[PDB]
Write a protein that binds this ligand. Structure first.
Ligand SMILES: [Mg+2]
Ligand SMILES: [Mg+2]
Ligand SMILES: [Mg+2]
Ligand SMILES: [Mg+2]
Ligand SMILES: [Mg+2]
Ligand SMILES: [Mg+2]
Ligand SMILES: [Mg+2]
Ligand SMILES: [Mg+2]
Ligand SMILES: [Mg+2]
Ligand SMILES: [Mg+2]
Ligand SMILES: [Mg+2]
Ligand SMILES: [Mg+2]
Ligand SMILES: [Mg+2]
Ligand SMILES: [Mg+2]
Ligand SMILES: [Mg+2]
Ligand SMILES: [Mg+2]
Ligand SMILES: [Mg+2]
Ligand SMILES: [Mg+2]
Ligand SMILES: [Mg+2]
Ligand SMILES: [Mg+2]
Ligand SMILES: [Mg+2]
Ligand SMILES: [Mg+2]
Ligand SMILES: [Mg+2]
Ligand SMILES: [Mg+2]
Ligand SMILES: [Mg+2]
Ligand SMILES: [Mg+2]
Ligand SMILES: [Mg+2]
Ligand SMILES: [Mg+2]
Ligand SMILES: [Mg+2]
Ligand SMILES: [Mg+2]
Ligand SMILES: [Mg+2]
Ligand SMILES: [Mg+2]
Ligand SMILES: [Mg+2]
Ligand SMILES: [Mg+2]
Ligand SMILES: [Mg+2]
Ligand SMILES: [Mg+2]
Ligand SMILES: [Mg+2]
Ligand SMILES: [Mg+2]
Ligand SMILES: [Mg+2]
Ligand SMILES: [Mg+2]
Ligand SMILES: [Mg+2]
Ligand SMILES: [Mg+2]
Ligand SMILES: [Mg+2]
Ligand SMILES: [Mg+2]
Ligand SMILES: [Mg+2]
Lengths: 200, 128, 61, 87
RNA sequence: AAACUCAAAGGAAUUACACACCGCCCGUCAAGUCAUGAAAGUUGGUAACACCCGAAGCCGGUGGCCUAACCGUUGUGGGGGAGCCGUCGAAG
RNA sequence: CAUUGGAGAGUUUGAUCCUGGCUCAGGACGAACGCUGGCGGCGUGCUUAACACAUGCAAGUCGAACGGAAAGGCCCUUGGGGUGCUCGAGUGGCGAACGGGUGAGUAACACGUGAGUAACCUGCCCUUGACUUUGGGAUAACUUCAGGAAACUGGGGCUAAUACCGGAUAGGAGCUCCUGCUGCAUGGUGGGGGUUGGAAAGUUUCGGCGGUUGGGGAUGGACUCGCGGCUUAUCAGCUUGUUGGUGGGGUAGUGGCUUACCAAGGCUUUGACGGGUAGCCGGCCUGAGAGGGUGACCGGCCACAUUGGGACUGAGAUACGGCCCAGACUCCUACGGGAGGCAGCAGUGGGGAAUAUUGCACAAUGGGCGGAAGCCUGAUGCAGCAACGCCGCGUGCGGGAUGACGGCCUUCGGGUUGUAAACCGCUUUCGCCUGUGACGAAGCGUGAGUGACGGUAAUGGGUAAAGAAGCACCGGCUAACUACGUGCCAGCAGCCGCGGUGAUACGUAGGGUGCGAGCGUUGUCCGGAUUUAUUGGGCGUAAAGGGCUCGUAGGUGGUUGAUCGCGUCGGAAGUGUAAUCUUGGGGCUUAACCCUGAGCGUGCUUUCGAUACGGGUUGACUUGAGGAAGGUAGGG
């Protein structure tokens, strides 16, 4: 119920950097496997499916839960892709990643599932915990000196925190100013393509 | 006989009762003549909401309460208004009150010791 | 009814108890059912290593 | 029966059946006596029989052997017949 | 109508044929297979009908037999009950 | 004075366009099967044989109604005190008609919805007005006798009641007569008079608890009715208590419910009668919607309890764990005769592709009895079992080029598996080990005490990157390709098709893709299918205009005045339980799930308005239509 295999293979297949940089993605222009350099047809399904899989492997969400997110966004009022990206960003592991306390979303999932975090006073070990507005995520007092935590404390200045979060790095406290908007989620997929895909 | 009793609802190991009016012969979780209130005992200082006018009407028309409903009416004070007896009538204590916006504004500004205990944990990694 | 027996390999014979599922064989007039390999007397195809579940072949270490 | 309550109940049901049957048969006999007096056309005999039958119908209704509505219906029939006889 | 069977059948037009007239294509007969009809008959099933008989039971009679409460002119009577008959009546 | 909603693809030809079927991509399930399988949360789990059932349990309770004393318990030289609590068996009261099960029957006022009863009954409960009077005779238990293998049965004697039966006294019960106000016809109701009548029970630990009868309330039931929801005309006639009337009977009650008499009706091509299938619904699935399919859990109504029939008792009965009779079954028998009904819970056999434990507790909620403590509760709360469904989590995280070996491919250059590994540093959710340890109980109990679940959830500590990944697919639709083997063989396939020696379609391998504790297959339903087209199709040649006309029912209607207000439209009130569903808040660490507010409940009834249109009633007009007179053509 969690993808544990290599991520560079998925990034190469999907054609975009799922996470990180300056890595084995120097072989980017071609998917993994023996048949990587051949010319591709890329149907509309192919395109749509690529966008959906890009979002899925970026956020570490499997198909059933991603589908559930899709119906929630579709029911919600407003743009379906905007709401879907808003939900995926409101996931707690992504919140930790965006605040910059984790090197990657996989590391954020690791620490969240291991329970190194407090949500507004209550301990949460659910990576899919949907953080609500005005929430206060806190690092567990016992685990305020994790090696990944201190690496993040050394590196966060380079990292860019989105406008909808406030982070007290050394304190391990992520204040949620508001639930993010499409202009605030970084554009790296085609949510419109995903929405069109979930209609066929 | 017409009874004022509790109709069980909710999950396994999580009961919420509806103080309802139905005759004795009816099954426990069935059609009720009228729904009077609710009773959540699983919650802190159990929630006890009883419609005073309706419960007074049904007591005056002759509905027989079950012992549980008698306890709830004692706590709501209805069991004293009807069948006047010297009982404490301990109207439910509230199950306290949290808040979110005030805490967020308190911490947004908290700043100071936020990043301050934060550089103290910097000294901690030093200690780490 | 007449039932097809899929897969390379076959053991079932006269008075062999079988499980019969739906399924048409297009180039066979009058065959509208297939025999479920790996159930009752009929057994899984011997040398399967791909699509084993559809031929009732247990996984090999 | 399989329940001792039910065995007790069949015994008491038989007892109550005896009682009720006796009372109903007495009611029928009284009403028949009134009807035969009315057919004979007598006035005093029919009046006396009607009084007896109505009293016994009310007594049975009180005893619960018959419903009070049934007692009232039969009394009404008897009284109307007696009135027609008198007229 | 159905079983059964095919993955086409078809309309107009372009350059019933397009493997292109050494084309295509129809029906008997012979062989096999499958589904179906008829058929002397044969074997079941269901729903009732008309009669005969008719348990329980309620009701309607009758009760010479049996009856503690009621009434007595205190020899009993009233009323009830067993029994019996009749209608209806399951089953056969 | 805007919308929350609609995707196609393949296949007829040499090629094309159209028509058109077939097939597929989606969703779903009370599913089954194959391979595989870690955990948790919440649900669900005989759809077939309404098949036959071993065993335990599922309905009892009351000594404050009664005689009592067979047990325990106190007091006494072992019996004895019924003496007090207590208490088998027995009478008596109440309950047993609820709860629980199943869906066989039923095409029907069974159900949904809305009304009517001036045709109704209603124990316990509440309320209010009267009362609770005077007598009597039995009987179970017990005792004795007889009979029976048993089940048990019949005598003799004996005994108590809130058991049973006389009487008195009581309206709004019968009959009848005045009179007030009135409805919807039968009528309803207020007041007075005459006449004939109808009850009861006592008990206590003195704190209680009960009895009878009027009138209201509440509750539950009953009947009647308008409207609504299957198929079949290769079923056209059906009915004789049938349709109506009058008198009687009956019933809680109206009624051919029943009966006697009289009449000849009643239903039906707008489908009676017959056949087929089926419990109905709130809902569920699907769908843009309209619809289509469906009636598991949960909730409402109905029906049924071995098959058929019947009543009895009761306030109330299809009387599941009642009775009677018959049939079919099973069992006991001493052969004379007896006993029984899991579609209650668990369970067995059987059938089947297929569906669980002969569990714990009355702690909570609900129910029965008791004045109460309390007793009973296979209701229920729980646990066990199964990936059956939904949801959540894990099987690691960061770094790591020297792009290592090894597989596989190759153009022998290399490429690929692949940051994958090795290696380095981390983290400890779940699992395993160990500690702490609940809520549910503002209950209950005079108190003492009191949680089945349960050492459970939750949580601290410890272990090791470890105990934890499979399944399908890769020709097109359709995301993903090569090598080897095979050689129209073996085989594949949902359709098109593939295999005849270079197979991206068979088999294996490497690589890849989609999903993931699941993944596929099969079955079934809806979608795509506008492929029954009301929304939303067509009929010259593609399937489709009757051979033609007349004409019945039916459908439909030129201009206009007046009026009705049935359709139609707009308010109001009532109803549409709950759950579900949509949505706003809240709780479970999140989610599923749960609670709560609102909406929805697309209707129906009542009532008040509007009158443009449809229709009804009614009156005009002549242009449609027909007629008269004259003219007139023709193988009618
Ligand atoms: Mg007699
Ligand atoms: Mg009468
Ligand atoms: Mg034939
Ligand atoms: Mg006869
Ligand atoms: Mg008789
Ligand atoms: Mg006599
Ligand atoms: Mg007879
Ligand atoms: Mg017969
Ligand atoms: Mg053609
Ligand atoms: Mg072709
Ligand atoms: Mg006893
Ligand atoms: Mg029931
Ligand atoms: Mg049902
Ligand atoms: Mg009495
Ligand atoms: Mg109808
Ligand atoms: Mg009549
Ligand atoms: Mg049926
Ligand atoms: Mg239906
Ligand atoms: Mg049900
Ligand atoms: Mg009765
Ligand atoms: Mg019973
Ligand atoms: Mg019952
Ligand atoms: Mg039974
Ligand atoms: Mg069972
Ligand atoms: Mg079997
Ligand atoms: Mg209780
Ligand atoms: Mg108590
Ligand atoms: Mg018991
Ligand atoms: Mg492709
Ligand atoms: Mg080859
Ligand atoms: Mg359609
Ligand atoms: Mg279809
Ligand atoms: Mg068409
Ligand atoms: Mg036309
Ligand atoms: Mg044609
Ligand atoms: Mg013509
Ligand atoms: Mg013709
Ligand atoms: Mg006409
Ligand atoms: Mg008109
Ligand atoms: Mg007009
Ligand atoms: Mg709700
Ligand atoms: Mg929440
Ligand atoms: Mg509702
Ligand atoms: Mg008109
Ligand atoms: Mg002329």
């Amino acid at each position: 119920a969690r993808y544990t295999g290599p991520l560079t293979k998925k990034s190469r297949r999907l054609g975009t950097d799922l996470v990180g940089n300056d890595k084995s993605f120097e072989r980017r222009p071609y998917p993994p496997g023996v048949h990587g350099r051949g010319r591709t047809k890329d149907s509309e399904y192919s395109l749509q499916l690529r966008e959906k899989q890009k979002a899925r492997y970026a956020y570490g969400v499997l198909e059933k839960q991603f589908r559930r997110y899709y119906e929630e966004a579709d029911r919600a009022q407003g743009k379906t892709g905007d709401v879907l990206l808003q939900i995926l960003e409101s996931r707690l592991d992504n919140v930790v990643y965006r605040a910059g306390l984790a090197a990657t979303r996989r590391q954020a999932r690791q620490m969240v599932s291991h329970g190194h975090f407090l949500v507004n006073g209550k301990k949460v070990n659910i990576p899919s915990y949907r953080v609500s507005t005005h929430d206060i995520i806190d690092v567990r007092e016992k685990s305020k000196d994790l090696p990944p935590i201190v690496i993040a404390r050394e590196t966060f200045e380079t990292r860019d925190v989105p406008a909808w979060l406030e982070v007290r790095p050394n304190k391990g406290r992520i204040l949620v100013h508001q639930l993010p908007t499409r202009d605030q989620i970084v554009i790296d997929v085609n949510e419109q393509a995903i929405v069109e895909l979930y209609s066929k | 006989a017409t009874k004022i009793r509790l109709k069980r609802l909710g999950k396994i190991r999580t009961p919420h009762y509806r103080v309802v009016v139905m005759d004795s012969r009816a099954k426990r979780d069935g059609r009720a003549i009228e729904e009077i209130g609710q009773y959540h005992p699983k919650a802190d200082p159990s929630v006890i909401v009883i419609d005073s006018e309706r419960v007074q009407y049904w007591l005056g028309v002759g509905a027989q309460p079950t012992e549980a409903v008698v306890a709830l009416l004692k706590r709501t004070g209805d069991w004293q208004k009807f069948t006047g007896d010297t009982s404490p009538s301990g109207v439910k204590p509230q199950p306290e009150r949290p808040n979110k916006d005030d805490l967020f504004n308190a911490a947004l500004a908290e700043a100071d010791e936020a990043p301050r205990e934060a550089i103290t944990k910097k000294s901690e990694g030093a200690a780490a | 009814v007449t039932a097809y027996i899929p897969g390379v390999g076959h053991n079932l014979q006269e008075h062999s108890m079988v499980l019969v599922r739906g399924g048409r064989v297009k180039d066979l007039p009058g065959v509208r059912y297939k025999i479920v390999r790996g159930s009752l007397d009929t057994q899984g195809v011997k040398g399967r290593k791909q699509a084993r579940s559809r031929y009732g072949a247990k996984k090999e270490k | 029966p399989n329940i001792k309550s039910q065995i007790k109940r069949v015994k008491t049901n038989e007892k109550s059946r005896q009682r009720n049957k006796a009372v109903k048969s007495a009611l029928r006999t009284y009403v028949r006596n009134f009807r035969r007096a009315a057919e004979a056309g007598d006035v005093e005999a029919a009046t006396k029989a009607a009084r007896v039958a109505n009293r016994q119908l009310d007594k049975a209704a009180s005893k619960g052997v018959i419903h009070k509505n049934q007692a009232a219906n039969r009394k009404s029939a008897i009284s109307k017949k007696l009135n027609s006889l008198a007229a």
